[PDB]
Amino acid sequence: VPEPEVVATPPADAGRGLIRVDSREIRHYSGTRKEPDYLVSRDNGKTWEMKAAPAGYPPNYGGIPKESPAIVRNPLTREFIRVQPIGGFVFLSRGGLDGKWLAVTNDGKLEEDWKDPEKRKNLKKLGGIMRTPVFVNKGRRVIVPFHNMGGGTKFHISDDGGLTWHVSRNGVTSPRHEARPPHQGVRWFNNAVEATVLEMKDGTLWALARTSQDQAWQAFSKDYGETWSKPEPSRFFGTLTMNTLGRLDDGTIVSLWTNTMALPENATAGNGTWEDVFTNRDSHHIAMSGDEGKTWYGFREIILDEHRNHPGYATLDGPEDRGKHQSEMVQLDKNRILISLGQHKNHRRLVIVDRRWVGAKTRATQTGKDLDSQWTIHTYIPQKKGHCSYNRKPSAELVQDPSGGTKKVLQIKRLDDPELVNEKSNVDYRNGGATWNFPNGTTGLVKFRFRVVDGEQADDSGLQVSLTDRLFNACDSTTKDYALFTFPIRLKPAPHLLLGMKKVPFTPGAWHEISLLWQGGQAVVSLDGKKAGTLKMANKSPNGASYIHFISTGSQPDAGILLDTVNARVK
Amino acid sequence: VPEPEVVATPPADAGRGLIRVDSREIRHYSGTRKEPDYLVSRDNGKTWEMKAAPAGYPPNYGGIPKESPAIVRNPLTREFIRVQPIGGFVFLSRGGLDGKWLAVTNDGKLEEDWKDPEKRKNLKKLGGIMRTPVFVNKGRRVIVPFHNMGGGTKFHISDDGGLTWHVSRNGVTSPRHEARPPHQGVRWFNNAVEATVLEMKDGTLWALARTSQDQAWQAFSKDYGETWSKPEPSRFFGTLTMNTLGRLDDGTIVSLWTNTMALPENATAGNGTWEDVFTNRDSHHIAMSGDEGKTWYGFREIILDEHRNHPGYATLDGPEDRGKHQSEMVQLDKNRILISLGQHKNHRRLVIVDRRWVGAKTRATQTGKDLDSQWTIHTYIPQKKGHCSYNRKPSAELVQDPSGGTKKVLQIKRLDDPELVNEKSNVDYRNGGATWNFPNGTTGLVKFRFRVVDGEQADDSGLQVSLTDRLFNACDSTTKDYALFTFPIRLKPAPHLLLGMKKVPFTPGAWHEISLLWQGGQAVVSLDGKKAGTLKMANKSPNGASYIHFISTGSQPDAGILLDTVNARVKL
Ligand SMILES: CC(=O)N[C@@H]1[C@H](O[C@@H]2O[C@H](CO)[C@H](O)[C@H](O)[C@H]2O)[C@@H](O)[C@@H](CO)O[C@H]1O
Ligand SMILES: CC(=O)N[C@@H]1[C@H](O[C@@H]2O[C@H](CO)[C@H](O)[C@H](O)[C@H]2O)[C@@H](O)[C@@H](CO)O[C@H]1O
Ligand SMILES: CC(=O)N[C@H]1[C@H]([C@H](O)[C@H](O)CO)OC(C(=O)O)=C[C@@H]1O
Ligand SMILES: CC(=O)N[C@H]1[C@H]([C@H](O)[C@H](O)CO)OC(C(=O)O)=C[C@@H]1O
Ligand SMILES: OC[C@H]1O[C@@H](O)[C@H](O)[C@@H](O)[C@H]1O
Ligand SMILES: OC[C@H]1O[C@@H](O)[C@H](O)[C@@H](O)[C@H]1O
Ligand SMILES: [Ca+2]
Ligand SMILES: [Ca+2]
Ligand SMILES: [Cl-]
Ligand SMILES: [Cl-]
Ligand SMILES: [Cl-]
Ligand SMILES: [Cl-]
Ligand SMILES: [Cl-]
């Protein structure tokens, strides 16, 4: 099955501006303040180059330099509508993207002479931070989600193709974060911002929005966006990152988001007006549904941020927002989807995924071979740098397999590194760890191979092993508290698994395999091919397991454990 | 970055008398024949009011009512020297402008009792028409340029702070103007007069002087003013108007002048002893150099004369010399410069400019909005009035955009106005036109939008479009002969551009955009975004292009063309 393939870097942060022109040409526009331009592919997304837009295409009067306007085709007229992420005007095409453009006036007319600054004074200016215009109701209505950070999302609505506009009666909201353990402070408050909208087969609109909770929240409309239900938690985990919904030609729904859990808030997190530090923006994920959202599959990592481990992460090539959050998609053919994702010129990417890979039931890995592409291992230097960022270090390193040969394996231990401690913000990220994604399953079997390091160990040394439903940081010791299933490997007095109350001893200084076969609310744990015990599920999930998470447990520097292979198969 | 800002009217014509007192106080003295006075700002140039000078400050024994004495601070003693534009005495201060003043005697002493008429008979009297004392050679020498109208510039030199004086061996001269076409007569002869002097980094002195040629002329001294090189044309275009050079705190050189070309001389211009009529004094310009004059930028219009279009220009509130020629400068801070400029109470101004505006690389305009501030459009009623002046009319007028809406656009046509003709002096200023400044560039891109008026046209109707290196009058049909690049838009037999030998048709009844992209000795011309042709440079420039000039070409009354926007970008 074809793995995700990076094909280009878009010329703006992802989420707006990616637009199919025809069966072979796709463009990604930009937020340039100069003469407008775009990145273009003429081979259906495989190769790309920059090009200047023609003279009839309007400059970015609104928007910001790092984000393109959203550009959307009207399915009835086959023309395009363009709005900015913020500010500026509503432009409609006549003759396509390379034809004439007209700006919408306050009185519902079209202005051809928008190069005249006097004539721009009477142009319609839609308010708020906007996302993507979406045509609904057999193309007869267009709605544009917009938000205020603390006020919530509402919708700009037009019933005449964008000539005249009204605002929905209500929209989407979500509650403030409540500081309770393990948090020592409050998350940045976003009130159901950055909504994405999908029309369902029964005509309902589903709005999915970014929140300060552990998951995105959602609401529904029965009147094409004029009024919306009470909001509620969605099944898509994630916090303060963006969701995008789409639909393939065959009706399959695609959900793109950053399926992560941030680190608990620290003791200097601020009052929640703005963010203190981002600890959850280094991946992007995909899931699909063939039955109108009744069931979902996939929950696969599209990509991990290539810079995630590095001690200069926060400031390399300018401090602007960075990572793998935000996305937009264009279907390429029956199997392939093009995704623009991420923020910052060193991080944002155009990636081709294959739905057959989304639907796969197995995955395997070896830490020595696959660390850079597949393994989340970063810890943080807890000193805020750049714009709401931390620099990182790898929390674990590859070492020679003590059995000999050429294998390299991952040493997971409690680190002797004072730089990973901030006493004022009261955080200590010295426990090394590692986490790895696999296709989601409510029933599955995961096997991993590990070895106790021949070295000094602390009284509490070992490894907490968890199955989770989103990506928890490698250094997050609270993962077990949210996990679907979790148990410790304890090294002292002698090595053993603790499965409920049962202790299962095993030898140090030798490779061993542990299997977890989970189904419903129970997991059976095996050691070297022999049933060892069972685990009761610690937390229910709306989706199932899609990560295994390993973190050291020692509270003083130790030698820890080595991790070799992991494989997973789901039902 | 602010555009130039008028802040006051000085109490004398510009060029002498503007003097910084301290970090916040600046004064402009006057030529009053009564008790001396000055205009003063106590907020570093922003606001101004008149004040009487204190009792120790001498009256203007020399000079003339419309000009202040020059006042200059000695950088070593921190005291001041004062000389008149003509006549009078040499005064030195002891205790500053509001302290004691002493007059220099013929025998190199200082007279304290200059209020006594008897004692004034033995005071030193420097001859000629004098400009500004300048201290050179680490402040150890002071020199004062002086001239005779037909004899040339020389320098009064003192090596003891103004106590004793000698004259330079030579100075600056410049040739008489020659009456060759398009002239029908000779320009007023001035022999390198009104010099301004700047000390260069290497100790050379540069003198820049007003002439009867198309540009100021210059000469150089290697001995702090005793002897001067042969004279030569300078890079600063202009005729029979004043130059001023100065240097900012950071070493940047500033050149202020009137960057214009006068109309060709007419058939009754006289023998050149004195002027017949001034046709080039309605603007002032600035340029700067950070590399001791090797490279210059700016060439921007500081201001246009607000009265320039009017049919009573020559006589309003008295006929004395008027316009925007003559200037003097005082730096205000790192970015801003105060300039006194012009002549006549209704015309002379104190203006603050910003060096970041001087260094800008773009400008844009729309005729209907910007005509009064930015567009030179005047034609002349060719009847001499007042003192060497013509009354004017606007040669082009704003009309409704035919596309509809509130936009106004400028109609440029051959006028039916016999008042614009003088058959004895043989001039006919009935071709309307318009010209607009932009920052200098040896490379650049200028775009303008035009449309043919729906009306009857003559066989030669159209618009001659020129890029120039100084301001040519709106009604000057010879501009094309001096232009860096030029070409005609012709309306008959059908509308077309003529680019060399290539005819490029365009439609009537619609707006069109022409682009001119120049580099070196060629300009690429585009029409509505499509390359149309090329133009070879018609005349080289020492500086580059800083004006676009549009003039009607019809020789009988016609409907002409409309002009909407122009924009410019240089240093590509
Ligand atoms: C436009 C701008 O500079 N805004 C500043 C910052 O705004 C936002 O910060 C959040 C995180 O809190 C997020 O990264 C947004 O993308 C970003 O625009 C923010 O630093 C704020 C802090 O007081 O100041 C704003 O001016
Ligand atoms: C002092 C005076 O009245 N001078 C007369 C005039 O002199 C000068 O004229 C030139 C232009 O020719 C210029 O305008 C000077 O500023 C001005 O002083 C001039 O009219 C001259 C003509 O014969 O007679 C002078 O007496
Ligand atoms: C106009 C603006 O600020 N857009 C920003 C948006 C906004 O801050 C958030 O939606 C809360 O309002 O989020 C961020 C972000 O990476 O957090 C990137 C966008 O550029
Ligand atoms: C004493 C005197 O006449 N000074 C005049 C000066 C002089 O005529 C010229 O320098 C040729 O000598 O020029 C003029 C002028 O605007 O032309 C204004 C001065 O008041
Ligand atoms: O989760 C509750 C929601 O479930 C959806 O299937 C339905 O379309 C919504 O109207 C709402 O009932
Ligand atoms: O234009 C010629 C002049 O160039 C100057 O740089 C130099 O100082 C003068 O002495 C003279 O050579
Ligand atoms: Ca936070
Ligand atoms: Ca003359
Ligand atoms: Cl960018
Ligand atoms: Cl816009
Ligand atoms: Cl499909
Ligand atoms: Cl006066
Ligand atoms: Cl005097």
Author numbering:
A (entry chain A): 25 to 595
B (entry chain B): 25 to 596
From the paper:
The mucolytic human gut microbiota specialist Akkermansia muciniphila is proposed to boost mucin-secretion by the host, thereby being a key player in mucus turnover. Here, we describe the specificities of ten A. muciniphila glycoside hydrolases, which collectively remove all known sialyl and fucosyl mucin caps including those on double-sulfated epitopes. Structural analyses revealed an unprecedented fucosidase modular arrangement and explained the sialyl T-antigen specificity of a sialidase of a previously unknown family.
Uniquely, AmGH181 displayed exclusive specificity towards the sialyl-T-antigen amongst the tested O-glycans, which was not hindered by α2,6-sialyation or β1,6-substitution of the GalNAc unit. Comparison of the ligand-free and the ligand-bound structures of AmGH181 revealed the flipping of a tryptophan (W298, 56.3 % conserved within GH181) in the ligand-bound structures. This conformational change positions W298 to stack onto the GalNAc unit of the T-antigen, thereby defining subsite +2. The invariant histidine (H411) from domain B forms potential hydrogen bonds to the Gal and GalNAc units. The galactosyl at subsite +1 stacks onto an invariant tryptophan (W212) and is additionally recognized by two hydrogen bonds. Collectively, these aromatic stacking and polar interactions provide a plausible explanation for the strict specificity of the enzyme.
